[PDB]
Amino acid sequence: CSPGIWQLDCTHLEGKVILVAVHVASGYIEAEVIPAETGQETAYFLLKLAGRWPVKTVHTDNGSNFTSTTVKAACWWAGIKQENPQSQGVIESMNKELKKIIGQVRDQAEHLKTAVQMAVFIHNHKRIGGYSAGERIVDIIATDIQTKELQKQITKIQNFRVYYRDSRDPVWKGPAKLLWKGEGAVVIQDNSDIKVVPRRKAKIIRDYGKQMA
Amino acid sequence: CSPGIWQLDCTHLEGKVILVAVHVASGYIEAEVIPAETGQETAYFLLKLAGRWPVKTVHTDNGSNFTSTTVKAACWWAGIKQEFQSQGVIESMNKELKKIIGQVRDQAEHLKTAVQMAVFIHNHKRKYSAGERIVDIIATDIQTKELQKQITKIQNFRVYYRDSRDPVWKGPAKLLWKGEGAVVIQDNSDIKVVPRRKAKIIRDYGKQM
Amino acid sequence: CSPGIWQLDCTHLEGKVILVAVHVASGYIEAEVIPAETGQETAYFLLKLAGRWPVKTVHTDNGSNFTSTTVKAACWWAGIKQEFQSQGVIESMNKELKKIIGQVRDQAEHLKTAVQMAVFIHNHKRKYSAGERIVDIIATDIQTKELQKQITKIQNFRVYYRDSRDPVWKGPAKLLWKGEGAVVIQDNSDIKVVPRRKAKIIRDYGKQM
Amino acid sequence: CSPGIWQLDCTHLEGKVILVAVHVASGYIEAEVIPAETGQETAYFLLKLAGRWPVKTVHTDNGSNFTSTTVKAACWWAGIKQENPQSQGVIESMNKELKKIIGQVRDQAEHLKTAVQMAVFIHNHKRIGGYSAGERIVDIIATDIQTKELQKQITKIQNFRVYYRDSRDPVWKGPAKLLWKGEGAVVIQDNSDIKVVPRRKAKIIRDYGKQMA
Numbered sequence: 001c002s003p004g005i006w007q008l009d010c011t012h013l014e015g016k017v018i019l020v021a022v023h024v025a026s027g028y029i030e031a032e033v034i035p036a037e038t039g040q041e042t043a044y045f046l047l048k049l050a051g052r053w054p055v056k057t058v059h060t061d062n063g064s065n066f067t068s069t070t071v072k073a074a075c076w077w078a079g080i081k082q083e084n085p086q087s088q089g090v091i092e093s094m095n096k097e098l099k100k101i102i103g104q105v106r107d108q109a110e111h112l113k114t115a116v117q118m119a120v121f122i123h124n125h126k127r128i129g130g131y132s133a134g135e136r137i138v139d140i141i142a143t144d145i146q147t148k149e150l151q152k153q154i155t156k157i158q159n160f161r162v163y164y165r166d167s168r169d170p171v172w173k174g175p176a177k178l179l180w181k182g183e184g185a186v187v188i189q190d191n192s193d194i195k196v197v198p199r200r201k202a203k204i205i206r207d208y209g210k211q212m213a
Numbered sequence: 214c215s216p217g218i219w220q221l222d223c224t225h226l227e228g229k230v231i232l233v234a235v236h237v238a239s240g241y242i243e244a245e246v247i248p249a250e251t252g253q254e255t256a257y258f259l260l261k262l263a264g265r266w267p268v269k270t271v272h273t274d275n276g277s278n279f280t281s282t283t284v285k286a287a288c289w290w291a292g293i294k295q296e297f298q299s300q301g302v303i304e305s306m307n308k309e310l311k312k313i314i315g316q317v318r319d320q321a322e323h324l325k326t327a328v329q330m331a332v333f334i335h336n337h338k339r340k341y342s343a344g345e346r347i348v349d350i351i352a353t354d355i356q357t358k359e360l361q362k363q364i365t366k367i368q369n370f371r372v373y374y375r376d377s378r379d380p381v382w383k384g385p386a387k388l389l390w391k392g393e394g395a396v397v398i399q400d401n402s403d404i405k406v407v408p409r410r411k412a413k414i415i416r417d418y419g420k421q422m
Numbered sequence: 423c424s425p426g427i428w429q430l431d432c433t434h435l436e437g438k439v440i441l442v443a444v445h446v447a448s449g450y451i452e453a454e455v456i457p458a459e460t461g462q463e464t465a466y467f468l469l470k471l472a473g474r475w476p477v478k479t480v481h482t483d484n485g486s487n488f489t490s491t492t493v494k495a496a497c498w499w500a501g502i503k504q505e506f507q508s509q510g511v512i513e514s515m516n517k518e519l520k521k522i523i524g525q526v527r528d529q530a531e532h533l534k535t536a537v538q539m540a541v542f543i544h545n546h547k548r549k550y551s552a553g554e555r556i557v558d559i560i561a562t563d564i565q566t567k568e569l570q571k572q573i574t575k576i577q578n579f580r581v582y583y584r585d586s587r588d589p590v591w592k593g594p595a596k597l598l599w600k601g602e603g604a605v606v607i608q609d610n611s612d613i614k615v616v617p618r619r620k621a622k623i624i625r626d627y628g629k630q631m
Numbered sequence: 632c633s634p635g636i637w638q639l640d641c642t643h644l645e646g647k648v649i650l651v652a653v654h655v656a657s658g659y660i661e662a663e664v665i666p667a668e669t670g671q672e673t674a675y676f677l678l679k680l681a682g683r684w685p686v687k688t689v690h691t692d693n694g695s696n697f698t699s700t701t702v703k704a705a706c707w708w709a710g711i712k713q714e715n716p717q718s719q720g721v722i723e724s725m726n727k728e729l730k731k732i733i734g735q736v737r738d739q740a741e742h743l744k745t746a747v748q749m750a751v752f753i754h755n756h757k758r759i760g761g762y763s764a765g766e767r768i769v770d771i772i773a774t775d776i777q778t779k780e781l782q783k784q785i786t787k788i789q790n791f792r793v794y795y796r797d798s799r800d801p802v803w804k805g806p807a808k809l810l811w812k813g814e815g816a817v818v819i820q821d822n823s824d825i826k827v828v829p830r831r832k833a834k835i836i837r838d839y840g841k842q843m844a
């Protein structure tokens with residue numbers, strides 16, 4: 001979702017147009033210099049972009065190169081799918097800030113391109129709050145990574161359907177999902193009510209025969 | 214040791230020349246394709262490479278790509294210090310890479326396109342898998358330095374305790390923990406914990422500029 | 423080396439026991455008189471002593487005064503590290519001190535009073551003189567660290583120049599000076615200066631936390 | 632003068648009264664703990680105080696111990712002579728600040744006295760403007776040291792009286808002091824006018840026969 005999204009921009013310098021690859025929350029940015037900006041050139045970056053990390057969706061306000069098929073297509077191989085005021089505000093500014101950064105080392109660099117990357121190195125590296133945006137991406141990603149596997153775990157759990165005794169005497173009530181399994185232990189919710197029960201008490205059914213696995 | 218360590222190796226390939234990044238624990242790669250090959254040309258990408266991953270050092274099969282001044286020039290901006298069967302594995306990776314490119318080669322007119330795709334495959338390739346990558350590792354590292362710092366802080370402080378029932382006062386000892394009722398510490402071989410009245414812990418000392 | 427270095431030595435004297443500070447280049451002393459002698463008691467004054475002069479290390483004739491925990495305790499708050507004919511000169515100083523006290527002894531009922539006076543005499547005693555003291559030395563030191571820092575900064579930076587008329591680019595070289603028209607640098611054995619277009623100087627690199 | 636002056640105060644803690652020795656410009660402060668405050672005790676500090684550095688004059692708003700002879704007397708052996716709103720404002724505050732500092736490490740120290748010195752160590756040591764007050768004293772002193780010797784040099788120069796030819800033909804005018812001597816070189820001011828002249832042109836007279844030296 002929002003962790004997946006990255007913001008992409010192109011601005012013109014010395015005629016030559018810069019390639020900008022902002023990360024929406026982490027702010028890690030990858031930018032690249034192409035002798036000429038083209039939808040063609042745009043794609044080459046994207047492949048690497050997906051390669052550094054997965055993006056569900058990427059944003060550009062207008063489509064001059066994105067609309068171009070090679071770009072739309074590239075998005076499909078990645079499966080990245082082309083596209084909050086506060087989030088909105090940061091991007092133009094994000095583009096703006098690097099230039100300011102860029103100017104400082106321009107005298108520092110023979111080649112403007114050589115300079116821009118340096119400009120970017122610092123931006124990821126520069127920082128009492130935060131460890132710098134670049135550091136943030138690794139984390140944001142990390143938390144998500146756990147999440148996804150966990151979600152998957154959750155999904156796995158969701159399928160199975162519970163059988164419960166409750167008191168040893170009572171008539172049965174419709175089956176519920178199982179939150180957790182311990183030996184002699186099960187956790188489920190009949191409707192909204194949560195109860196834990198012993199193994200001999202409850203049998204746990206596999207939800208899917210015929211699964212392709 | 215391995216974290217923050219990346220390996221780049223010369224690639225011989227049909228047509229244009231490209232070089233591929235390796236982070237050894239992830240095996241992660243961020244290769245780029247260059248029409249012209251010089252360690253220098255290599256540098257521009259490398260400069261891009263460090264930002265995505267701070268890399269402490271790199272070990273090179275060939276001095277010559279390393280020898281070019283500009284290449285060292287990159288090392289310094291980075292503060293990267295060149296790291297003067299595992300290489301065969303990196304090689305194997307390169308090999309794997311080559312194979313991968315081939316599988317998808319038909320799909321793309323341009324070799325470069327293929328290579329990135331190839332990069333993609335190694336990347337996010339299920340297998341506990343390489344694809345998930347070292348991000349978890351980097352995070353653990355991000356977490357790691359602070360702990361190393363806090364412990365280093367605990368290490369920095371010197372705490373002076375008196376064995377209970379002993380007028381003689383015990384030498385400063387590395388403190389394991391601080392508690393308002395009691396703080397835990399080891400002098401060297403023997404570790405003891407005492408109540409606040411029994412011992413005192415200096416606040417700061419000046420060193421390190 | 424000598425600046426920031428002070429020597430304290432055990433004093434045997436009539437009545438009460440006092441110990442005297444020495445800064446070797448100044449020969450400056452800030453002795454105090456203690457009814458009870460322990461390295462510990464010594465410490466309270468020492469703690470006072472460091473503030474007036476940061477002292478890096480002290481060399482002691484006797485381990486025992488040094489051995490007491492509290493004494494080491496003082497060393498650490500200071501970050502002072504005990505420094506495990508010149509000693510005879512310090513001794514001579516002590517001797518001189520003793521004599522000095524005697525000259526004025528008659529004037530004062532209390533031995534302590536005399537000693538301070540004695541301290542005063544060594545102090546501000548004309549002779550290029552000790553009395554003017556190391557203050558000039560301390561100042562030069564205060565000035566010194568910043569220069570060592572600025573040079574260290576110049577040392578930190580690496581500058582890359584191309585010999586004029588040479589496509590081959592010269593390895594980074596320690597830069598002696600920066601000029602908008604030209605900057606001065608030495609690679610190692612040979613030192614050359616070039617115009618800004620001929621060479622480039624990286625802005626910063628990251629190291630030292 | 633003002634470099635010479637130091638500010639001295641006594642405040643009461645735990646009944647016991649602290650001894651405070653502020654430096655007017657440098658702010659370096661020496662303070663000492665006396666089991667009991669007395670004019671007697673006060674003196675002991677002063678001797679050391681003059682000993683660390685010379686003070687022309689020292690300040691206390693009221694005289695309970697200073698008025699005491701032993702204190703006045705002590706001042707004479709040192710030759711220190713007992714006694715600007717901004718300068719005035721800093722002292723009470725100076726006394727106030729250390730206490731705040733003192734409290735922090737009080738838990739740090741078994742003995743309050745042990746603590747106060749530490750409190751002071753920091754105050755001299757703690758610092759983008761300045762190198763910290765303590766560092767300042769060494770400097771302020773240093774500049775003064777040069778000054779005094781220089782003044783002395785000046786005084787030496789002042790005594791001598793100049794004889795000048797000016798043009799080789801002209802009648803002479805009253806003698807002036809000599810600012811500087813170079814071989815074949817002399818600098819003097821006849822009244823307010825400054826002129827430089829050759830040796831053969833001008834003779835330089837020693838100002839004092841009968842000097843005790």
Ligand SMILES: Cc1c(-c2c([C@H](OC(C)(C)C)C(=O)O)n(C)c(=O)c3ccccc23)cc(F)c2c1CCCO2
Pocket residue numbers: 040043044047069070071073074075076077078320321322323324326327330
């Ligand atoms: C085919 C192709 C193209 C594509 C190409 C390719 O070369 C590029 C340098 C443009 C990446 C290629 O090697 O095939 N080419 C050459 C095209 O002519 C083209 C035309 C229309 C749409 C896509 C491409 C563009 C892509 F970004 C892309 C792909 C496939 C994988 C996902 O990304």
Ligand SMILES: Cc1c(-c2c([C@H](OC(C)(C)C)C(=O)O)n(C)c(=O)c3ccccc23)cc(F)c2c1CCCO2
Pocket residue numbers: 109110111112114115118253254256257260282283284285286287288289290291582591622624
């Ligand atoms: C300047 C420079 C150079 C360098 C350059 C630069 O342009 C490249 C296209 C080679 C990156 C530059 O913009 O100055 N150039 C042009 C040189 O001529 C050069 C010569 C000797 C050593 C380094 C460079 C090479 C580097 F690897 C490098 C840097 C700066 C950052 C750290 O790494």
Ligand SMILES: Cc1c(-c2c([C@H](OC(C)(C)C)C(=O)O)n(C)c(=O)c3ccccc23)cc(F)c2c1CCCO2
Pocket residue numbers: 373382413415462463465466469491492493494495496497498499500740741742743745746749
């Ligand atoms: C605490 C302490 C001690 C210390 C003390 C202290 O009181 C003295 C009167 C001895 C200075 C204190 O106030 O705590 N005390 C009381 C101890 O009992 C003690 C025992 C072992 C080691 C040091 C001290 C000794 C020191 F040299 C010292 C310090 C702190 C600053 C650095 O130097």
Ligand SMILES: Cc1c(-c2c([C@H](OC(C)(C)C)C(=O)O)n(C)c(=O)c3ccccc23)cc(F)c2c1CCCO2
Pocket residue numbers: 529530531532533535536539671674675678700701702704705706707708709
């Ligand atoms: C005599 C004396 C006294 C003095 C003393 C002396 O002992 C002190 C501990 C008080 C310093 C001394 O050793 O003589 N004594 C003991 C007195 O009784 C006394 C009485 C009146 C005035 C001064 C002193 C006080 C001083 F601060 C002092 C001097 C002389 C040198 C300058 O300073």
